[PDB]
Ligand binder design. Structure first.
Ligand code: HEA
Ligand code: HEA
Ligand code: CN3
Ligand code: PCF
Ligand code: PTY
Ligand code: PTY
Ligand code: CU
Ligand code: ZN
Lengths: 55, 114, 99, 51, 530, 117, 268
């Protein structure tokens, strides 16, 4: 049903393929919010984990 | 013109071996798939129709069996062995939880220091 | 395979040489075998150099012949044997040139 | 690197045209890799009494 | 660029990390050998911890972060696309996670030392030494995860090579006609696949016995620590036959290029190269002869791991047959590949002496083992890594490496690491045990001989950094003067100089027919062979 | 205006390689909801001529400089192998016939021209 | 002609644009492994960073998969060899995941083939009571023999061309597997011996433990095989996202039958 419809949109899109879905703008900025926290807070506790300060 | 005559020779000998076999495999997608309808919904589903009710009745005699042990031990536990309960480095998501989900009908773990 | 089938095969390929490339690529594998080539086939290794008008690929014949002769006694008898066809074409050797 | 198969453009370095000399950024990648056990011999001795 | 999925630019990131992990993997071995210079703890003050931490910190950077990502990642992601005839790998998007988990395999290991405990467990991480009652902190928790990230990179980094070789060849490239470097890694990829899931259960079970107290290995509960000695070593002996089979691929190309001759018995060299890989599976408890196995079980292995010396003799005597007749052009890859043929084979004679169950009972955990496995790791897998870099450095980077300065880097590696690892056979034949910060006073003899050499080899490695500086800055001004060697194949005796520049590269592989450096699309047409 | 191809002959650009939409109730029947370059290989596979070549070079004759071996190239530098006049008689040697220069094959003696197309 | 041939690709194998989800999954595997080793030793206080690490990883797989289905049905470099590339790339992959069972089968033959001294001289030992194979575990074998007769009843049915058997035949197989999760949830809630029950408690929730940790992804694999077949993504001549599901289950009959014969029949 949407397979030919999306094929007009995906082919000749001149976009990155992870921006080529029409339902993709909301898929990234909350995803970049959980990505901007899950790679610092496991590492920010490492100077807390050097002095014996645990929980 | 120059340099653009044709791709190659259209011999049509490489055809009619892959195309007609797509209908032959379609036959093999028809009668072989109809060979399994006499054994999946006609044999195997009646086979579990006599097996699930065989296990619907033996489930209830064990569902009542757990109510005996969680009610009273009537003296104490039978003092389980040294390999059955181990608590070196107790668990981290809670305080002393055995796993993610565990009922005390089989996992009581009462300490016998004595 | 044998010594004679070695001679008849490479004395044949020197005739359709037609170029400087197909002399040196055929003079190479006429010298890069286990055995030592006969003077019958090396006479067509100088006539091949005359057909292509190149002299140092005829001076390099007798220098490849000098290292791969395995005996100096088997070289001077081999040098004097080729002196009949080495004085027509005027091919010097590398020691006489003193380059 | 997607395109421009030049001479220095298959390496993620910036060899020529750098603002700073390259020996700063080349020895400074390989001596820093040499000085990581010498900080494992620092924060584990100073923690454990030695110096 | 960071996340480009081109297989060429991934393998230059592989090689950019295998020297950074190299200059960390040998700076730890510097301090290890500095402490064995004299009896009494000299530089480490009195700490016998941070010495079983540095030994495991060094022995896993050398195995899993130097020789694994270079001979499989640094070359296999560059040459197996190129020599076979592919444009890039068959699975190019997972080709980028196979590199980018390796710095995440480093943050999971350098932080495993900086935490309060330090994983003093040794490279063979044994269960009751690494149990939670013995090792308490989160030190060994991260050391059993950095070994898992590399276990999962080099696992999908070998699924990337079975469905590259089996279908993505050229027209005439039949299954009997491939370069031997591809048959190295394609045989290796059938050992990386069939030994790493064995390892991944043998480490996760130790994780379960440390914070989930499941007692796979805990003695209070009947869990053996001797199950670990056959389950880790079921991975362990194929792992050390994976650091040497791509080492057997580079040497088979170098020794038959710098000798103008095809390799002796090419069909004999591909059947005796999977037979090493297949029969290497069936010998995995020769490490554990003394651990209390049966009198017939040890009688089987003392006859079965000697048969690994049957196909390795074929793969050496043919390298002494492929250079007998031909010329010899003694450049730097030929110097390494001809000292590989003397120091690896002396690490093979010490192999069959250790291979017996009747003789390992006076040699286990001594320094005679460390004399044996360093003649086949720093002399059989660095002698084929230096002979693979120098053999493909100006072809791939485009710049020549000051050949007059790479000869002095060979000799300072040859005699400056033979001085370390040859007297180790004497300290071990007396019975000096391993992993010890101090020793009895009679073992101060050769341990000062082997301490003077670790500054020799790691002065050559400081020189090798300068060769990498001379190759990138004015590495273009090397092939226009008389600094380097340009043509790795000098022409024949009757090949004229003016005809050589028409037909220059007489290679047997595509790797030199490409440009220097190769293009970002070096294959945009299906090439043909014979 | 931009129609479909439904034959190997007409391509005339990349926008004409798609197929037509199928109605609900039946599956895609391998010719309707196709994609493009996969459909392009299938459209060639629908006919009797392969789009890509799996066949060695014509290694029967040697090939002199007056009579060279012509390869069906599609760019400037199509690499070739040279394994013999019986295609098995000597060690391989890889070549690169470039634009209007020939690869000469020092061992076997075969001459190749480009035919750049 | 040649002008369109100079506008297309000349080799059948696929070339992919540079995607950044390679380093996204790599950053998740760091924050999985680093954070699962911190909360075992403190430094955080709460056990939800691992729950975060199971969320950022799995949404990174479907964003990886959203670009792949954009290549599967919307860009399409899937030729015959590239179809054979993944179909051999996955058939050779499950040789690794059937050998990890030999890293768990061989522990069961390490504590029962030779009797030990810390336990009893019998396997399973005293104090530990095992479930007979003539009980609800025998339902677990027949429900997969019925699964092995409906995954091929709907394999050829999708190629057959009719959607009445192809669409509905995969919804009845999907709920045949979620119902298999709940009967392996009974022994995770009603069996006597636990995970910490010695060596019998170790390997029994490992050999059957990893067999439970694959149905969470197999039912998640049916979760897109029904969504794509309803959104008309999958085809009847080219199906990779449907073919990897059948070989995920046709080998599962072999490993569960080898799991049933030694854990339950030989395990009493
Ligand atoms: C890949 C394997 C590898 C390599 C190369 C080395 C290399 C070296 N190792 Fe190590 N070592 C091990 C693996 C390795 N080792 C293992 C497994 C153990 C046992 C641990 C345990 O079981 O307890 C061990 C243990 C070990 C011990 C302790 C012995 C014992 O307790 O068992 C010592 C001490 O002498 C030692 C020293 C050295 C030295 C001086 C080198 C020198 O060769 C290093 C200096 C030489 C170089 C200069 C070349 C290497 C440098 C590079 C960067 C590579 C070049 C490559 C590229 C750049 C292209 N090693
Ligand atoms: C990385 C490469 C590598 C290679 C190739 C080998 C190859 C071999 N290894 Fe070694 N080995 C290691 C690395 C390697 N090993 C490591 C890292 C350890 C453990 C250290 C640790 O635990 O920390 C180890 C441990 C180890 C042990 C355990 C000792 C102990 O811990 O108690 C034993 C004993 O059986 C052994 C034997 C062998 C044998 C027989 C070979 C054979 O494959 C080699 C045979 C080769 C030849 C023999 C030479 C060439 C052939 C000939 C010229 C012709 C045939 C020969 C004759 C007829 C004599 N190895
Ligand atoms: C963490 C990273 C740290 C890296 C530090 C590593 C340092 C290693 C440096 C090695 C080096 O740079 O040497 C290369 C340099 C250039 O050489 P080239 O290849 O261009 O050819 C030159 C031409 O062909 C022959 O050079 P020539 O023969 O004319 O000169 C004689 C030269 C030879 O003697 C020696 O090599 C040892 C002293 O002696 C001297 O110059 C003495 C002058 C005081 O040759 C030299 O001139 C070296 C001079 C001495 C430098 C100090 C030596 C310390 C051991
Ligand atoms: C890298 C990242 C890590 C990848 C591996 C993670 C897998 C392990 C996760 C374990 C999580 C956990 O806490 O599992 C506990 C479960 C539940 O066990 P239980 O609920 O106590 O069962 C007893 C039944 N009662 C008595 C309660 C009625 O006990 C189980 O049944 C455990 C099931 C999982 C078995 C895993 C086997 C590991 C083999 C190697 C895998 C490597 C890949
Ligand atoms: C174990 C990992 C999976 C092993 C099998 C991978 C190879 C077969 C599957 C496959 O081909 O897709 C891959 C993507 O999967 C992936 O990359 C997903 C694996 C990584 C996330 C794992 C999440 C587990 C939950 C390749 O991807 P590709 O884009 O290179 O193939 C381009 C196709 N034409
Ligand atoms: C468990 C760890 C698994 C590790 C990776 C396993 C990958 C196996 C399948 C490999 C994918 C093959 C493939 O490319 O098929 C495409 C999509 O498949 C897929 O996308 C399969 C997705 C599998 C999802 C299950 C894994 C985790 C699920 C989420 C957490 C629960 C569809 O190609 P096509 O043939 O449809 O093209 C037809 C267009 N006309
Ligand atoms: Cu071994
Ligand atoms: Zn030839």
């Amino acid at each position: 049903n949407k397979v030919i419809q999306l094929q007009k949109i995906f082919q000749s899109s001149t976009k990155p393929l992870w921006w080529r879905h029409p339902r993709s703008a909301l898929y990234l900025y909350p995803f970049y919010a959980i990505f901007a926290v899950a790679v610092v807070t496991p590492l920010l506790y490492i100077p807390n984990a050097i002095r014996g300060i645990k929980a | 013109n120059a340099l653009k005559p044709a791709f190659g020779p259209p011999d049509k000998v490489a055809a009619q071996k892959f195309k007609e076999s797509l209908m032959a495999t379609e036959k093999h997608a028809k009668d072989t798939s109809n060979m399994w309808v006499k054994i999946s919904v006609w044999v195997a589903l009646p086979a579990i129709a006599l097996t699930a009710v065989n296990t619907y009745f033996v489930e209830k005699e064990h569902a009542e069996h757990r109510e005996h042990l969680k009610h009273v031990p009537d003296s104490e536990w039978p003092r389980d062995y040294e390999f059955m309960n181990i608590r070196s480095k107790p668990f981290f998501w809670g305080d002393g939880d055995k796993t993610l989900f565990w009922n005390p009908v089989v996992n009581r773990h009462i300490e016998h220091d004595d | 395979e044998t010594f004679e089938e070695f001679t008849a095969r490479y004395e044949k390929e020197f005739d359709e040489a037609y170029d400087l490339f197909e002399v040196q690529r055929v003079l190479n594998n006429c010298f890069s075998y286990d055995l030592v080539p006969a003077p019958a086939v090396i006479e067509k290794a100088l006539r091949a150099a005359r057909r292509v008008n190149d002299l140092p690929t005829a001076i390099r014949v007798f220098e490849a012949l000098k290292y791969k002769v395995e005996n100096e006694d088997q070289y001077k008898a081999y040098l004097d044997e080729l002196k009949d066809v080495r004085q027509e074409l005027g091919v010097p050797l590398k020691e006489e040139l003193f380059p | 690197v997607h395109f421009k198969d030049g001479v220095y453009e298959n390496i993620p370095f910036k060899v020529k045209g750098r603002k700073t000399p390259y020996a700063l950024s080349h020895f400074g990648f390989f001596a820093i890799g040499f000085a990581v056990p010498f900080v494992a011999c620092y924060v584990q001795l100073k923690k454990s009494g030695a110096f | 660029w960071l996340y480009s999925t081109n297989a060429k630019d991934i393998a230059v990131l592989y090689f950019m990390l295998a020297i950074f992990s190299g200059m960390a993997g040998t700076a730890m071995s510097l301090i290890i050998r500095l402490e064995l210079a004299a009896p009494g703890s000299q530089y480490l003050h009195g700490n016998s911890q941070l010495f079983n931490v540095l030994v495991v910190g060094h022995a896993v950077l050398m195995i899993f972060f130097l020789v694994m990502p270079a001979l499989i990642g640094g070359f296999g992601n560059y040459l197996l696309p190129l020599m076979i005839g592919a444009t890039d790998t068959a699975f190019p998007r997972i080709n980028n996670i196979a590199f980018w988990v390796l710095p995440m395999g480093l943050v999971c290991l350098v932080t495993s030392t900086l935490v309060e405990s330090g994983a003093g467990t040794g490279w063979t991480v044994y269960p009751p030494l690494s149990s939670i009652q013995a090792h308490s902190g989160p030190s060994v928790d991260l050391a059993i995860f950095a070994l898992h990230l590399t276990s999962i990179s080099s696992l999908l980094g070998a699924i990337n090579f079975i469905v590259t070789t089996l279908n993505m060849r050229t027209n005439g490239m039949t299954m009997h006609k491939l370069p031997l470097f591809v048959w190295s890694i394609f045989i290796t990829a059938f050992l990386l696949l069939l030994s790493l899931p064995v390892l991944s259960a043998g480490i996760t079970m130790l994780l379960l016995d440390r914070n989930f107290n499941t007692s796979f290995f805990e003695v209070s509960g009947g869990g053996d620590p001797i199950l670990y000695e056959h389950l880790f070593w079921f991975f362990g002996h194929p792992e050390v036959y994976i650091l040497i089979i791509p080492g057997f691929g580079i040497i088979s190309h170098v020794v038959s290029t710098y000798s103008k001759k095809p390799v002796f018995g090419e069909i004999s060299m591909v059947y005796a190269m999977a037979s090493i890989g297949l029969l290497g599976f069936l010998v995995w408890s020769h490490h554990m002869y003394i651990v209390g196995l049966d009198a017939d079980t040890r009688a089987y292995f003392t006859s079965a791991t000697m048969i690994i010396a049957i196909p390795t003799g074929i793969k050496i005597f043919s390298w002494l047959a492929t250079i007998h007749g031909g010329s010899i052009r003694l450049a730097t890859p030929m110097l390494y590949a001809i000292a590989f043929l003397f120091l690896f084979t002396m690490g093979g004679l010490t192999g069959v002496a250790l291979a017996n169950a009747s003789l390992d009972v006076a040699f286990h955990d001594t320094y005679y083992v460390v004399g044996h496995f360093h003649y086949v790791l720093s002399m059989g897998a660095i002698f084929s890594l230096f002979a693979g870099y120098y053999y493909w450095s100006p072809q791939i980077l485009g710049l020549n490496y000051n050949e007059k300065l790479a000869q002095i880097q060979f000799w300072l590696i040859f005699i400056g690491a033979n001085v370390i690892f040859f007297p180790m056979h004497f300290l071990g034949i007396n019975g000096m045990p391993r992993r010890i910060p101090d020793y009895p006073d009679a073992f101060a003899g050769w341990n000062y001989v082997a301490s003077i050499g670790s500054f020799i080899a790691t002065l050559s490695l400081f020189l090798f950094i300068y060769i990498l500086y001379d190759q990138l800055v004015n590495g273009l001004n090397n092939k226009v003067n008389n600094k380097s060697v340009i043509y790795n194949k000098a022409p024949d005796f009757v090949e004229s100089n003016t005809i050589f520049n028409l037909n220059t590269v007489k290679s047997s592989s595509i790797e030199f027919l490409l440009t220097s450096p190769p293009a970002v699309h070096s294959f945009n047409t299906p090439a043909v062979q014979s | 205006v931009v129609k479909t191809a439904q034959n190997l002959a007409e391509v005339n650009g990349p926008e004409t390689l798609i197929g037509p939409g199928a109605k609900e109730g039946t599956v895609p029947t391998d010719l309707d909801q196709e994609t493009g370059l996969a459909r392009l290989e299938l459209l060639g596979k629908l006919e009797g001529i392969d789009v890509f070549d799996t066949k060695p070079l014509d290694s029967s004759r040697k090939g002199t400089m007056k009579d060279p071996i012509i390869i069906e190239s599609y760019d400037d530098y199509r690499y070739v192998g040279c394994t013999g006049s019986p295609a098995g008689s000597h060690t391989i040697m890889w070549l690169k016939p470039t634009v209007n220069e020939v690869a000469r094959c020092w061992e076997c003696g075969s001459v190749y021209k480009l035919n750049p197309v | 002609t040649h002008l369109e041939r100079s506008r297309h690709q000349q080799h059948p194998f696929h070339m992919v644009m540079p995607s950044p989800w390679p380093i996204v999954v790599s950053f998740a595997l760091l924050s999985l492994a680093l954070s699962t080793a911190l909360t075992m030793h403190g430094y955080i206080g709460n056990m939800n960073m691992v729950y975060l690490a199971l969320f950022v990883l799995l949404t990174s797989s479907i964003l990886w998969f959203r670009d792949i289905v954009a290549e599967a049905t919307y860009l399409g470099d899937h030729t015959m060899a590239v179809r054979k590339g993944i179909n051999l790339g996955f058939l050779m992959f499950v040789l690794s995941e059937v050998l990890i069972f030999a890293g768990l089968f061989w522990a069961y033959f390490h504590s029962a083939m030779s009797p030990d001294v810390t336990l009893g001289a019998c396997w399973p030992p005293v104090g530990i009571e095992a479930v007979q194979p003539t009980e609800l575990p025998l339902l677990n074998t027949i429900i997969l023999l019925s699964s092995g007769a409906t995954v091929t009843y709907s394999h050829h049915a999708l190629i057959a061309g009719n959607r009445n058997k192809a669409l509905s035949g995969l919804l009845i197989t999907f709920w045949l597997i979620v119902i298999f999760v709940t009967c392996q949830y009974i022994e995770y809630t009603n069996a006597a011996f636990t995970i910490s029950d010695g060596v019998y408690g170790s390997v029994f929730y490992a050999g059957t433990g990893l067999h439970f940790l694959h149905m969470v992804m197999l039912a998640a694999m049916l979760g897109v095989n029904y969504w794509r077949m309803r959104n008309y993504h999958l085809t009847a001549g080219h199906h990779v996202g449907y073919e990897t599901t059948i070989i995920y289950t046709h080998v599962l009959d072999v490993i569960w039958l080898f799991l049933y014969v030694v854990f339950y029949w030989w395990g009493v």
